[PDB]
Design a binder for this molecule. Structure first.
Ligand SMILES: [Zn+2]
Ligand SMILES: [Zn+2]
Ligand SMILES: [Zn+2]
Length: 178
């Protein structure tokens, strides 16, 4: 197995996947690495199994249909993986914890949102459809863009949203378009 966490790229107290060479900090993996279970399979492996069991699940889908899906176990998993793929980028640090807003010429968002809040919401089964999860994720980046206005820091929101959107299109097999 790898000797660094797949998500944050640091060493430490790592749990190793049994079916692939990735490793994780306990709370870096989503869901948090499970207490027992030998063997243990990571979320990457669990997602690959879904695909392998239903190869047609990789055919193109419309985003509008994906968003209306109820959060049954497979969609829960897919949203957990999508969240993890965002944490995998180091620029996620900016959006992880609860933000605060005191900048001359700007007013904070009406509905603040952050990664750790989304993480808690998934853990607590608060989303009933994929749409809930995707709306809160997109709100993170939209709040950022609106607040930071012409400051060049706005670009961090564009960058991490792009990671989100690419991974959303891949994990939910969104039909490719120009
Ligand atoms: Zn880690
Ligand atoms: Zn694995
Ligand atoms: Zn099948």
């Amino acid at each position: 197995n790898s000797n660094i966490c797949e998500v944050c790229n640091k060493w430490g107290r790592l749990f190793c996947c049994d079916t692939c060479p990735r490793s994780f900090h306990e709370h870096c993996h989503i869901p948090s690495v499970e207490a027992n279970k030998n063997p243990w399979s990571c979320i990457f492996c669990r997602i690959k199994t879904i695909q392998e069991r239903c190869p047609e699940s990789q055919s193109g889908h419309q985003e509008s249909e994906v968003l209306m899906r109820q959060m049954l176990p497979e969609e829960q998993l897919k949203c957990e993986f999508l969240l993890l793929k965002v944490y995998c980028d180091s620029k996620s640090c900016f959006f992880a914890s609860e933000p605060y807003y005191n900048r001359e010429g700007s007013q904070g968002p009406q509905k603040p949102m952050w990664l750790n809040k989304v993480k808690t919401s998934l853990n607590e089964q608060m989303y009933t459809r994929v749409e809930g999860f995707v709306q809160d994720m997109r709100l993170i980046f939209h709040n950022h863009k609106e607040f930071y206005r012409e400051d060049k820091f706005t670009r961090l929101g564009i960058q991490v949203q792009d990671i989100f959107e690419k991974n959303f299109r891949n994990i939910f097999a969104i039909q490719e378009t120009s």
